[PDB]
Amino acid sequence: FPVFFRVMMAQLESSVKSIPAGKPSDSGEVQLEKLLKWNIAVRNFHILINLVKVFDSRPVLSICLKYGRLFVEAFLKLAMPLLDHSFKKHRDDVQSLLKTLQLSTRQLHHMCGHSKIHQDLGLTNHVPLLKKSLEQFVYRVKAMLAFNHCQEAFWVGVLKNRDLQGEE
Partner 1 sequence: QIRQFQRSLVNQLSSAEDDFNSKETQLLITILSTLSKLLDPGSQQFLQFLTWTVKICKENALEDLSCCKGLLTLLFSLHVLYKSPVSLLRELAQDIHACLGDIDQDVEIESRSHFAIVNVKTAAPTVCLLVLGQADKVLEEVDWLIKRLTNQTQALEKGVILQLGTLLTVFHELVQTALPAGSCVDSLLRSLSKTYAILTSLIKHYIQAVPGRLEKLVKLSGSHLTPQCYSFITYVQNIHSESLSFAEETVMAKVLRDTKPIPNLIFAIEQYEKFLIHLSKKSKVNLMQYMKLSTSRDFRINASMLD
Partner DNA sequence: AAAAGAACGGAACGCCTGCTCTGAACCTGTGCC
Interface residue list for partner 1 (CB under 8 A): 91, 95, 98, 102, 106, 109, 112-113, 116-117, 119, 121, 124-125, 127-129, 131-136, 138-139, 141-147, 150-159, 161
Q: Which is nearer to partner 1, 60 or 134 (CB)?
A: 134
CB of 138 to partner 1, least distance (A): 5
How far are the Cα atoms of 76, 153, 166, 167 from residue 110, in angstroms, in the given order?
21, 26, 9, 9
Is 1 within 8 Å of 60 (Cβ atoms)?
yes
Single out the residue of 11, 25, 50, 125 in contact with DNA (rule: CB under 7 A): 125
Q: What is the DSSP letter of 9?
A: H
| CA 51, 142, 163, 129 torsion-angle sign | positive
The three-class DSSP label of residue 142 is helix
Site for DNA in 50-89 (CB under 7 A): 62, 66
CB of 73 to DNA, least distance (A): 14
